[PDB]
């Protein structure tokens, strides 16, 4: 009743939890399928009600005993399934008498013993499954009773070795599976007399050397060994398998494959050798003209024969990824070649004929070579090439002739490729990677639509340097006011009046530092004025040249000198308000200047921290820094500001000189307030950019870096009353 009879009286009773053979079924049924039931044992004459049974499935029950007089009289049985049961051995006595059986499954039974008289009377058996049993050795004598077998699998068993004449009587075997046995040795005649064999699997065994038994297989077509310990493949290994088609030889430590190993193989399709380090000559592939994909990645190939092309007429894929290749013979012919990967070699040039013809060449890859020149029309003859990956080479000039059809171009390396690409040549190019973002800038990115890996990001300006006219005008104003007022303050202080107290000396020195900051801003704005709308051409050499280095040095020197002079002024004011000192203060100022100079020259010779932006300032560090200079400068400046603030507040708590006190207080407040945003934006790229724009970062840095330099002299001139009187008296002196 639980059975679900089909149209052609095919009883299907699976998963019903039965404990015995179903009863009350049609005696004329063909296929019986009791798979997931709990049939522990088969009693005697359990199938007496199914004389015409044709296919019996018992896959899944905890079957552990089959009576000898069970499944008897089933002379029409053809398929028997006993895979996932718990049989500890092949049922030698139970299985006999099935003279019409054509397929037997014994996959998952924990079989460890095979009786010597098993498989008796199976005259026309054609498929055998012994996958997951725990067999120790091949049952040679039991297999001697199956001369009509056509498919044998012993995949997951535990077989140590195959003795001589193991399968001598299997004259009609076709498929042999020995996937995951721990085979370590094969005798010379184990596969003797095993004609008609077409598929041989030895994937995950532990073969030491290359077996010779395959020399006795005259009809082999597919051969596998995936995870053996094979190290050397002697020449002439495959001379006994003229019909061999696929050879699976990977993931094993190959060392030396000889020269003529893959020789005179007519129907071989793909050859893939990786890791054969000791190989130093190209394989003698004469006679193998039907090859379709050839890869020799890891070896020591020194040259490519000129006869590689004009033979293997299909050759849809060529790969040589780790070789000592220096010369590239012309690939004249071989029109079906689609992909070429010649990377990590010693190629030093590409000649005009090197890729002559090459119809349907889609992908070309030379990503690591010592290439320093490319012929003008080296790519003229190319067809529908969609990928040309030429990176990490010593390129100086990249020809573009015959490259209109390119779909993706890579030039990640080639730091010497200062030339700017012409976007006219590449019409339908979609993705491009270039050594510098200024090359991409000519392609109208971020606006037919082309993607670039190095983004301009408004930090390497494709347009004018400063950007908005508001920023340009305010930076010009900052430069003008800083330069003029610092010059005026210096002329008033150091020239006319002979009074030289420590406070006046520090004021003059900080005005000098602000003057240097102003002249840095002035050269920056002069560069921007010169490069109006065409900043890409100027910036392609500004960062590389010494102008960026000298401007960055001036900026960092000015900033550090100003900070150090402010700190020294705070210390001097503290000492003066506490209650000869000229010499020590002067030498301290000299030490501060030398420290600023060495801090400025540190990135000039060390690590090349400049050239990160046209602003040539390592402090904003728009790109991710090495945290060797930026963080050190940030912490040093923060510590100096904290010390100055603590000193100022201590002296204010403790308390003519009030004018100097308030002047220094205003100076400290202005410098700290205007330095805070620069320090904030210094580490902004390092942290996740939650609504953080590189454009606004550049804007803030550009507007706030010279602001203290533009602001200090104005405050000094306008506010200090006694120093204004000094200005008046010195003006009278110079007029007189």
């Amino acid at each position, epitope marked *: 009743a639980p059975c679900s009879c089909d149209g052609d009286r095919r009883v299907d009773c699976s998963g019903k939890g039965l404990t015995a053979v179903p009863e009350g079924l049609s005696a004329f049924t063909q296929a019986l399928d009791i798979s997931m039931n709990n049939i*522990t044992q088969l009693p005697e004459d359990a199938f007496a009600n199914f004389p015409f049974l044709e296919e019996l499935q018992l896959a899944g029950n*905890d079957l*552990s*005993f089959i*009576h*000898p007089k069970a499944l008897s009289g089933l002379k029409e049985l053809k398929v028997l399934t006993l895979q996932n049961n*718990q049989l*500890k*051995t*092949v*049922p*030698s*006595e*139970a299985i006999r008498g099935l003279s019409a059986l054509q397929s037997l499954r014994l996959d998952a039974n924990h079989i460890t*013993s095979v*009786p*010597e*008289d*098993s498989f008796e009377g199976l005259v026309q058996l054609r498929h055998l499954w012994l996958d997951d049993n725990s067999l120790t050795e091949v049952p040679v004598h039991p297999l001697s009773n199956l001369p009509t077998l056509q498919a044998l699998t012993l995949a997951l068993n535990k077989i140590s070795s195959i003795p001589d004449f193991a399968f001598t009587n299997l004259s009609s075997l076709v498929v042999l599976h020995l996937h995951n046995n721990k085979i370590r040795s094969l005798s010379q005649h184990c596969f003797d007399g095993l004609d008609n064999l077409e598929t041989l699997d030895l994937n995950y065994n532990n073969l030491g050397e290359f077996p010779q038994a395959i020399k006795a297989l005259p009809s082999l077509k597919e051969l596998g060994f995936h995870s053996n310990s094979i190290s050397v493949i002697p020449d002439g290994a495959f001379d006994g398998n003229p019909l061999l088609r696929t050879i699976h030889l990977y993931d094993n430590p190959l060392s030396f494959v000889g020269n003529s190993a893959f020789h005179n193989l007519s129907d071989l399709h793909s050859l893939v050798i990786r890791g054969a380090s000791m190989v130093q000559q190209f394989p003698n592939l004469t006679g193998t003209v039907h090859l379709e994909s050839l890869t020799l990645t890891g070896t020591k190939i020194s040259s490519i024969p000129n006869n590689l092309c004009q033979e293997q007429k299909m050759l849809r894929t060529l790969d040589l990824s780790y070789n000592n290749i220096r010369d590239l013979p012309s690939f004249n012919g071989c029109h079906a070649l689609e992909e070429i990967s010649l990377q990590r070699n010693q190629i030093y040039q590409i000649k005009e004929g090197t890729f002559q013809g090459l119809i349907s060449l889609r992908i070309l890859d030379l990503s690591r070579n010592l290439i320093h020149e490319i012929h003008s029309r080296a790519f003229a003859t190319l067809g529908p090439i969609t990928n040309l990956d030429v990176s990490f080479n010593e390129l100086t000039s990249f020809p573009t002739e015959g490259l209109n059809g390119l779909n993706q171009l890579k030039l990640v390396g080639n730091f010497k490729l200062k030339e700017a690409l012409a976007a006219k040549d590449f019409v339908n190019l979609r993705s491009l990677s270039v050594p510098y973002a200024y090359q991409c800038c000519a392609f109208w990115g971020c606006d037919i639509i082309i993607h670039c890996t190095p983004s301009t990001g408004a930090f390497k300006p494709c347009e004018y340097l400063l950007g908005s006219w508001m920023i340009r005008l305010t930076v010009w104003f900052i430069f003008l006011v800083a330069l003029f007022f610092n010059l005026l303050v210096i002329l008033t202080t150091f020239a006319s009046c002979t009074s030289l107290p420590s406070s006046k000396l520090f004021i003059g020195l900080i005005s000098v530092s602000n003057l240097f900051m102003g002249i840095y801003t002035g050269i920056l704005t002069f560069l921007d004025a010169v490069s109006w709308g065409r900043f890409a051409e100027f910036g392609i050499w500004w960062e590389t040249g010494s102008g960026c280095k000298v401007a960055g040095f001036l900026a960092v020197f000015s900033s550090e000198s100003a900070i150090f002079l402010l700190m020294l002024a705070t210390v001097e004011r503290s000492l003066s308000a506490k209650d000869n000192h000229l010499k020590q203060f002067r030498v301290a100022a000299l030490l501060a200047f030398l420290g600023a100079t060495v801090a400025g020259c540190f990135p000039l010779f060390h690590r090349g921290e400049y050239s990160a932006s046209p602003l040539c300032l390592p402090f904003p560090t728009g790109e991710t820094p090495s945290l060797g200079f930026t963080v050190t400068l940030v912490l040093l400046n923060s510590l100096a500001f904290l010390l100055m603030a603590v000193i100022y507040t201590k002296l204010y708590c403790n308390l003519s000189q009030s004018s100097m006190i308030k002047h220094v207080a205003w100076l400290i407040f202005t410098n700290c307030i205007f330095f805070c945003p620069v320090a904030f934006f210094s580490f902004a790229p390092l942290i996740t950019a939650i609504s953080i724009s590189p454009e606004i970062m550049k804007s803030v840095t550009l507007i706030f870096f010279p602001l203290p330099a533009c602001l200090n002299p104005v405050l000094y001139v306008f506010f200090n009353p006694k120093f204004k009187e000094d200005w008046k008296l010195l003006k009278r002196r110079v007029t007189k």
Partner: nanobody
Amino acid sequence: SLRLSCAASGYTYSPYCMGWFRQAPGKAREGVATVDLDGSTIYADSVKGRFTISQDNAKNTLYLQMNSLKPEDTAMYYCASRTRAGVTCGLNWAIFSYWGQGTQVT
């Protein structure tokens, strides 16, 4: 302590590789003691020493004498035999052709 006697009805010549098997409910039939044509005897290791098996070819009957029984040996016992060309020892249930009715021992 007790003795199980097995009698064979069919008789052509000296039967080959007699044996005794034990089955706990809901599992396989393991072998406990077996003999062969020339009288060599193979015992199960877990039952080695205690049980003894003797065949009488005059009446072609098996006898299994069991002593010092333990509660885990409670199971159903069967008497199995074959006739032809058996080289493997009798501990394997597949090689046997004739199986007895089997009794229950507790």
